[PDB]
Design an enzyme around this catalytic site. Structure first.
Site, short mmCIF file in Angstrom:
data_model
loop_
_atom_site.label_atom_id
_atom_site.label_comp_id
_atom_site.label_asym_id
_atom_site.label_seq_id
_atom_site.Cartn_x
_atom_site.Cartn_y
_atom_site.Cartn_z
N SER A 1 0.78 -1.24 0.00
CA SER A 1 0.00 0.00 0.00
C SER A 1 0.82 1.30 0.00
CB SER A 1 -1.00 0.00 1.15
OG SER A 1 -2.01 -0.95 0.89
N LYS B 1 0.13 3.50 -2.97
CA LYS B 1 -1.02 4.35 -2.99
C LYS B 1 -0.65 5.73 -3.41
CE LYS B 1 -5.52 5.33 -1.22
NZ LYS B 1 -5.73 4.84 -2.59
N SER C 1 1.71 3.53 5.54
CA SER C 1 2.10 2.18 5.95
C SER C 1 1.84 1.16 4.83
CB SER C 1 1.37 1.77 7.22
OG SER C 1 0.06 1.30 6.94
N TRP D 1 2.06 -3.34 4.18
CA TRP D 1 2.33 -4.68 4.67
C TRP D 1 2.04 -5.68 3.56
CZ3 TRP D 1 0.30 -6.59 10.12
CH2 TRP D 1 0.83 -7.87 10.37
N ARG E 1 5.07 -0.70 13.30
CA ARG E 1 5.78 0.06 12.28
C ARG E 1 5.72 1.56 12.57
NH1 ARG E 1 2.05 -1.95 7.74
NH2 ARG E 1 0.85 -2.31 9.66
#
Length: 224
Positions: free
Chosen positions: A46, A49, A166, A168, A208
């Protein structure tokens, strides 16, 4: 020296395989348990994005109001998949080449290339990309860069502003965890950063962010 040392001391406290890259327009600095990770390529997940939104807005496949609205629905936060599909493979490919994003490879008819590959990117590439974004130095409309900037806005401490995204990657093995962003200082100065670490299933979702903020605090860059 003593600040860098103090940050290095922090990474003793957790057994994760990790790097934290900062970039201020001049120097790359690397901290963490596994510094090799800085120049290793991983799927953006992501963090993609950031590129998707820019490309979507530049090529009139969405308005920022539309993206902001989709991002704020009861619901982390993922790529706006319909927008990626409106851009489509042909345009996505040529736009990623044009802007120099990671390895610039999306495959052929890959639906979520940011999640599955073949698209990859180093932390060093990540941190320089969002620095360019922060400073309006990507080849996009300044307005478009500003509106993507504000989609990433997390927090303000004084007029120090934190921006972050963030990631993952759960579909690659080993899994990869991202916390990428920048702090725009009150004066004007910018420090971009990238946390890259190996993730496991069942890991804390908040780590994170919390590890990045602790580093930024120790660095004197941002006090959450």
């Amino acid at each position: 020296s003593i600040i860098d040392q103090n940050v290095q001391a922090l990474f003793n406290e957790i057994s994760a395989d990790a790097v934290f890259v900062t970039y201020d327009g001049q120097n790359i600095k690397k901290y963490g348990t596994h510094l090799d990770r800085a120049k290793t390529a991983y799927i953006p997940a992501s963090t993609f994005k950031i590129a998707n939104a820019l490309i979507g807005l530049e090529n009139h496949k969405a308005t920022s109001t539309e993206i902001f609205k989709w991002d704020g629905k009861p619901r982390t936060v993922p790529v706006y998949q319909e927008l990626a599909r409106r851009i489509g493979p042909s345009l996505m490919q040529s736009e990623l080449q044009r802007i120099g994003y990671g390895n610039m490879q999306i495959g052929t008819e890959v639906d979520q290339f940011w999640l599955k590959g073949p698209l990859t990117i180093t932390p060093i590439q990540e941190v320089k990309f969002v620095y360019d974004l922060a400073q309006g130095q990507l080849p996009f409309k300044p307005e478009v860069q500003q509106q993507v900037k504000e989609m990433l806005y997390v927090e303000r401490r004084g007029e120090n502003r934190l921006y972050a995204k963030s990631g993952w990657g759960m579909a690659v093995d080993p899994q990869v965890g991202w916390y990428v962003g920048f702090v725009e200082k009150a004066d004007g100065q910018v420090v971009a950063f990238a946390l890259n670490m190996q993730m496991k299933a069942g890991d804390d979702i908040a780590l994170r962010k919390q590890l990045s903020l602790d580093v930024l605090d120790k660095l004197g860059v941002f006090h959450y």
